[PDB]
Each structure stands twice: as C-alpha cells, then as structure tokens.
C-alpha cells in the first residue's frame, strides 16, 4: 500500500541548522526496509536535491509542498512550476545581500523557493525584514509562507494535501506529519491513516510524541510485513 511521510520534524528532528538534517544510519535502515514493502513517498517542502542527498535511497518524493516531484528518478514539475525557475534565481540574486543587512539572517536557495531563516537574527529588525520579503513576493508574483523562525517564498498554490490526494486517489494510505501543512494534508485525506507527530491539537487518527516514536511505529510496521509473508 501507500505511505506518505513528512521529513523535518517527522523522520528527523527540527534543528537550528536545517542544512545539517542528513538521515543517520538508523533512519536509512528503516526507510530502506520500508520501501521494500510499501510504495513510499517522502512529502516535504524541501527540494529534490535536498532530500536526495539527505536520504539517498530509492524512494519517490513530493517536494516543495507539491510544486515538483521525483518519481522513478525523474524530476517532474507539477502545475507548470518550472515557469518559476528564472524567478527564484532572480529573487536570490536580489536578496542574498540581506545577510549583511540583517546579521544572523540565513538564506537557503533552492530552484523553486528561497527560505529566509530568522533564527539567529536579532529581534528588532524582523518586522522590517518581513515587509521587505513581502515586497519581493509582490514584485515577482510569488507566494509567502510564514513558519517557526521561517519565512519562505514559494510557487503560488502549493499544497501537500492536494499533491498527496492526486497520487493516492482513494487508495488506502498512511500519512504522517508534524505541523499545520500536514494537518491540512490530513484534512484533504481524512479517509487515510493519519499520524500526527508532536504536541498540539490535531484531527489525525493516530498521534505520536516525536520523530523517535514515529520511527518506532515505522519499525513496527516493517516487522509486521516480515511475519505477514
Ligand atoms: Mg515537518
Ligand atoms: Na530538520
Ligand atoms: Na520530532
């Protein structure tokens, strides 16, 4: 059957340095085993280049919250998102210097998104930075996402739920995630086995404490298949 797994905060912990989130041997073994028994999909806001190096396994992925997928190794742009490739290049070029204007600010460039991390930044200039980002968004016609210590410019209309729905249709599936974008995905796929990771109110059918418990559940599902055959 199908299994859709969010990456950050679901399979790995949320950390201050997101560029370091490579999968450890434990996760590599778990997913390696899991993909042998289930059609496995990593669903993330990360790019295919990121997940590909973080988790170098033979699995499918829905990236950028659905703007691009990597299926059977093929980079597949969805909803004509490739029309935005030149846009994000320009956005990065015109805003990369902000790292000096706002010491502490970190900018993560991706083909279809530019993520501004305010984690190490001073509090005082955040409202100013936020307004600058929104201005760039209006200028280039892109969409702005506000997360925890994060502000990301992305392709308008991306939606994890819709992307997942599009793949599974009505087929049975497991869907796991840790934040609002996943909560929304559960809503768009409420007939699936929804799993919430972390604290907070949720409508998921099952709930786990953290990525460690999440991994344990996946570990168990694997053992179930070993007996099942
Ligand atoms: Mg997450
Ligand atoms: Na992470
Ligand atoms: Na976690």
UniProtKB/Swiss-Prot annotation:
Enzyme class: hydrolase
Key words of the record: Hydrolase, Magnesium, Metal-binding
Active site: 6 (nucleophile)
Stated name of the protein: Trehalose-6-phosphate phosphatase-related protein
Keyword flag Metal-binding: yes
GO molecular function, one term: magnesium ion binding
Cofactor: Mg(2+)
EC number in record: 3.1.3.12
Reactions the enzyme catalyzes: alpha,alpha-trehalose 6-phosphate + H2O = alpha,alpha-trehalose + phosphate
GO process terms (BP): trehalose biosynthetic process
Induction: By Tre6P.
Binding site for substrate: 6-8
Biological role stated in the UniProt entry: Removes the phosphate from trehalose 6-phosphate (Tre6P) to produce free trehalose. Also catalyzes the dephosphorylation of para-nitrophenyl phosphate (pNPP), but with lesser efficiency (in vitro).
SUPFAM superfamilies referenced in this protein's UniProt entry, alphabetically: HAD-like (SSF56784)
Pathway the protein acts in: Glycan biosynthesis; trehalose biosynthesis
Pfam families in UniProt: Trehalose_PPase
Similarity annotation: Belongs to the trehalose phosphatase family.
Keyword DNA damage assigned: no
